[PDB]
Amino acid sequence: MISLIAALAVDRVIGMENAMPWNLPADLAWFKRNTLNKPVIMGRHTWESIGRPLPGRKNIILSSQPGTDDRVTWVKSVDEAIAACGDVPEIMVIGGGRVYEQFLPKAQKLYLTHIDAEVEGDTHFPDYEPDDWESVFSEFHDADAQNSHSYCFEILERR
Ligand SMILES: NC(=O)c1ccc[n+]([C@@H]2O[C@H](COP(=O)([O-])OP(=O)(O)OC[C@H]3O[C@@H](n4cnc5c(N)ncnc54)[C@H](OP(=O)(O)O)[C@@H]3O)[C@@H](O)[C@H]2O)c1
Ligand SMILES: Nc1nc(=O)c2nc(CNc3ccc(C(=O)N[C@@H](CCC(=O)O)C(=O)O)cc3)cnc2[nH]1
Ligand SMILES: [Mn+2]
Ligand SMILES: [Mn+2]
Ligand SMILES: [Mn+2]
């Protein structure tokens, strides 16, 4: 099974200038809980944005060019990325925009954080079709001293 995990600001913005400008520790904790001990697939730009391997996960990087770091696994196509995960219950696709576009048609589950924040951005999560997806979990949180915007964790499953 393939799942996508992402945090979206207003208008489905996910990034600006190869960065995420906000800081929401509760959402990063949610990301870690839902990805630990699973393979994670990311594109090369997202690899550069994170800047280091994510511990406790098999890190698989998509790039058309040879890899430059043997601490992670480098693959050249979607099918190779999936194969490199092996026989696991759940593969996590962690972006960015171009990668989300390619994996969305193959995904059964979306883990989305909706952040109440207006961000200028240059990268968006794909337009998906709402009728295709059922909300199976949602949890709203007001802003607090650690998290400066309100946010909503949602899990969608393909109908
Ligand atoms: N808010 C969130 O949840 C979230 C999550 C992830 C990322 N982001 C943000 O998203 C942005 C990065 O997204 P992006 O769309 O620019 O880039 P991306 O999807 O991370 O990376 C695209 C790169 O991946 C490689 N690639 C993708 N598909 C491939 C394929 N089928 N075969 C081979 N290589 C493939 C290519 O690398 P080569 O050019 O080397 O061939 C391509 O240039 C940043 O702003 C980041 O902060 C946000
Ligand atoms: N919900 C969500 N939030 C995100 O921030 C996110 N980020 C990416 C890609 N970028 C990043 C950037 C940093 C870290 C990171 O530092 N993660 C640590 C945090 C642990 C914690 O804060 O508790 C990790 O071990 O996962 C992960 C992904 C993909 N999907 C996401 N999905
Ligand atoms: Mn092929
Ligand atoms: Mn197999
Ligand atoms: Mn806000």
UniProtKB/Swiss-Prot annotation:
Family that this chain belongs to: Belongs to the dihydrofolate reductase family.
Organism phylogeny: Bacteria, Pseudomonadati, Pseudomonadota, Gammaproteobacteria, Enterobacterales
GO cellular component assignments: cytosol
Source domain of life: Bacteria
Molecular function as annotated in GO: dihydrofolate reductase activity; dihydrofolic acid binding; folic acid binding; methotrexate binding; NADP binding; NADP+ binding; NADPH binding
Keywords: Antibiotic resistance, Methotrexate resistance, NADP, One-carbon metabolism, Oxidoreductase, Trimethoprim resistance
UniProt catalytic activity: (6S)-5,6,7,8-tetrahydrofolate + NADP(+) = 7,8-dihydrofolate + NADPH + H(+)
Name the UniProt record assigns to this protein: Dihydrofolate reductase
Alphabetical list of CDD domains matching this protein: DHFR
Effect the entry attributes to changing residue 16 to N: Increases catalytic rate about 2-fold. Increases catalytic rate about 7-fold
Biological role stated in the UniProt entry: Key enzyme in folate metabolism. Catalyzes an essential reaction for de novo glycine and purine synthesis, and for DNA precursor synthesis.
Pfam families named among the record's database cross-references: DHFR_1 (PF00186)
InterPro entries, alphabetized: DHFR (IPR012259), DHFR-like_dom_sf (IPR024072), DHFR_CS (IPR017925), DHFR_dom (IPR001796)
Presence of keyword Aminoacyl-tRNA synthetase: no
The DHFR domain, residue ranges: 1-158
Gene assigned in the entry: folA
Resulting phenotype, residue 152 to S: Increases catalytic rate 1.5-fold. Increases catalytic rate about 7-fold
Metabolic or biological pathway: Cofactor biosynthesis; tetrahydrofolate biosynthesis; 5,6,7,8-tetrahydrofolate from 7,8-dihydrofolate: step 1/1
Binding site for substrate: 5, 27, 52, 57, 113
Effect of mutating residue 85 to A: Decreases catalytic rate by one third. Increases catalytic rate about 7-fold
Keyword set includes NADP: yes
Biological processes per GO annotation: 10-formyltetrahydrofolate biosynthetic process; dihydrofolate metabolic process; folic acid biosynthetic process; folic acid metabolic process; one-carbon metabolic process; response to antibiotic; response to methotrexate; response to xenobiotic stimulus
Additional remarks: The strain K12 sequence is shown. Strain B [RT500] is resistant to 500 micrograms per milliliter of trimethoprim.
Enzyme Commission no: 1.5.1.3
Organism from which the protein derives: Escherichia coli (strain K12)
Coiled-coil stretches: none
